[model samples]
Target: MENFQKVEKIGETYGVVYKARNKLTGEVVALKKIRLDVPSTAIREISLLKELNHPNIVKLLDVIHTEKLYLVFEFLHQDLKKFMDASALTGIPLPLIKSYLFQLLQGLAFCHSHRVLHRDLKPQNLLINTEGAIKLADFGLAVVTLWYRAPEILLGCKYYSTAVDIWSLGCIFAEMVTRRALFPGDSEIDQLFRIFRTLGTPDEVVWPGVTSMPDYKPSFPKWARQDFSKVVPPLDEDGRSLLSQMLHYDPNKRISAKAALAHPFFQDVTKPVPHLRL
Candidate 1:
């Protein structure tokens, strides 16, 4: 902390983050300082990140362990949340939307391939640079934001998989197109209702063993399936199709990140330029 020059204070949740310049290399970096008392999540993030390497995933450069733990990472300009906020009035451009989604799916595919689940996947967790590179970050632990969480998790399913992340991706996809959260719920019940209203109520036919879940509610207002095209007016047919698949109620049937990358929505984006300045 004394050696590096602090540029600005980044946001803080469980830990504090700072944009700093390394004195030795004269390069900028994000320094995440976590107290030793809450070292478990920090340790888990370090262990998981060391094994995972991908262009779309935030790079963990180094870790300093002292009275407090500091995680050094490549600096990014902003997060998807700030980007969305900036574009809220006019909405994001179609070309850029497709590019961002493609990169997000690529990163997620890499994580899933390694059998890791990014339980939290919201705009706040997506770091972006001026070069238009989107990197998935904040893999510390699984205390997920309520709105982006999966239905299965809400239903108290003990065991889950990559589909949890897919659900969050679907929420993000909708937000990108609409410039607003797909399901902005005030509570857990509100969150579940919002999802049900958009996708319709799930049953055993669509989601096997849904009824047996510990938190399953026997009686809830039923909602008819919504027209996704109307929900995401800015998206094309192919994009809507892909979103529908990703938002499926059944985790087993939800589209995998690999398959999402191969979807027709990304056909034209198959080989996007590696980087861009937004």
Candidate 2:
């Protein structure tokens, strides 16, 4: 890795990605390099990456440091967002969505079981190769802000669990079914309403801590009046049912990654798009 040729810098944030050729297989890999000034989160990420090994999760090929550090990973042609945006013209088939969802849930299950929260689960973080196989990538490094951040993270809930990831996964599932992101709320209050107006609002009964969170406040009086039928208009029966289950305001009621996979929604999911075909 110290002597590998530098491919062009891919994305910009705390770090930059580069493509390098593997000496043995001659295959190219994407390398993640965090600038020295990068936050400690990257260090935490690197440590977590070293300990994590999952087929659904992207592999950390090598970590080499000379004057600077290098994190080499398998290369991908594009991410899920890029793929979905491109598929608009190509028309995404149900099978493709099923396959991607299955892979995503599989990856999330592994991370959650290990008590590791991605804290970020948008389509962009999910990478797909030219063959369509999907791999989860990117951590603490995206333009993504509020909406993807879970309610616990939003309300500053001191103690949150994998439910944060579940919320993002729910949003992701919505995106896959509709082929677009919804709400995109910039604030916790805004996000709450966006979720409430679409899915029914939660009350103290539905969510015990509804009024107890530090920033909690009563907003929608018509919690029962809200309707989801119109929110997921573009999605079919299966899609809507799945979305409803994920959008629960009570974080406790939200589906866990493993339980979600077992739900009938993705019972027929195809295998991961093998080799990451675009």
Candidate 3:
């Protein structure tokens, strides 16, 4: 009995994730040990993933704190970033991206319904199942990570909302088509300028605190570049339109996950995966 090994550390960060076999069910589970001493980010993941439940979302199985606090979740086969890297040569087709995005939207819609915004939604945060279905992972995290963050949040909107997710979705979609980050900004100002060049700068009237945000300032060269098409040349008309809506400068005007799910881009190209097993 003492010789039995149930868990193996696969990765570690703010928390350590181990592959553990459930003794009762004999099923492998992802055991995430979180340290209480960590910051709010870890706490947010726990709080958010626990409250959220959906087929396209990662499931939190159990929480243990006997000696060390741990979060148990279902083991995911692979993540979107992993798929993005090998997808082209690994049998992952174009429609597969659409299917995964659709599932992501379904999960995001659920989170939005509860007024919970997945501040950090990106490819790395998504898990793909063996059946090709996908789950949106890493809830209860910050509103935005270093990459794939909405311009509003990056621009200094403390009270950002679901629009942030839509912006991230746009970034992810662009990456899917091109297989590289669309607006890989080097600095906060550059990030804004890059986004602005692609989407056009938000009017002061539209984004009230634009000039007041930390590191906020007007750029002359950026002010006149109003061509969205030129910046992201590879994006098709449908892709551009969807990206535009997702990155709408005004949060209120930005597309919601549910609305985006019904967008023309998704309807035209993406076929629903019926009886999605994963």
**Largest lDDT belongs to which candidate?**
1
Model 2, residue 64: C-alpha shift (Å): 2.3
Model 2 lDDT tens row, 227-259 = 556665667777777777776777888888888
What are the models' TM-scores? 0.91, 0.85, 0.82
Best by TM-score: 1
Cα lDDT tens digits for candidate 3, 105-224: 888899889887878877877877666578876564552245687887776777878888878877887788777687787776677777776665766776665677665666535454
Question: Which 10-residue window in model 3 sums to the lowest lDDT?
Answer: 269-278
Q: Show where candidate 3 strays beyond 4 Å.
A: 1-8, 38-48, 88-92, 142-145, 205-208, 219-235, 268-278
Q: Who is ahead in lDDT, 1 or 3?
A: 1
For model 1, how many clashes? 1
Question: What's the count of clashing pairs in each model shown?
Answer: 1, 10, 2
- Can you list the residue pairs that collide in candidate 3? 44-140, 119-143
Over the stretch 1-278, how does candidate 1's per-residue lDDT look in tens digits?
Answer: 66688889987856888999998789899998874464566577676777688999999887776657788888888888888888777877777888988898989999888888888888998998766678899773654368898999888888888899999988998898988789998788889999999888888888898989888888988788788876888788999999999999999999999999888898787333323234
lDDT of each prediction vs. the true structure? 0.84, 0.72, 0.71
Could you give the C-alpha RMSD of every candidate to the true structure, in order shown? 2.6, 3.2, 4.2
Ranking by lDDT: 1, 2, 3
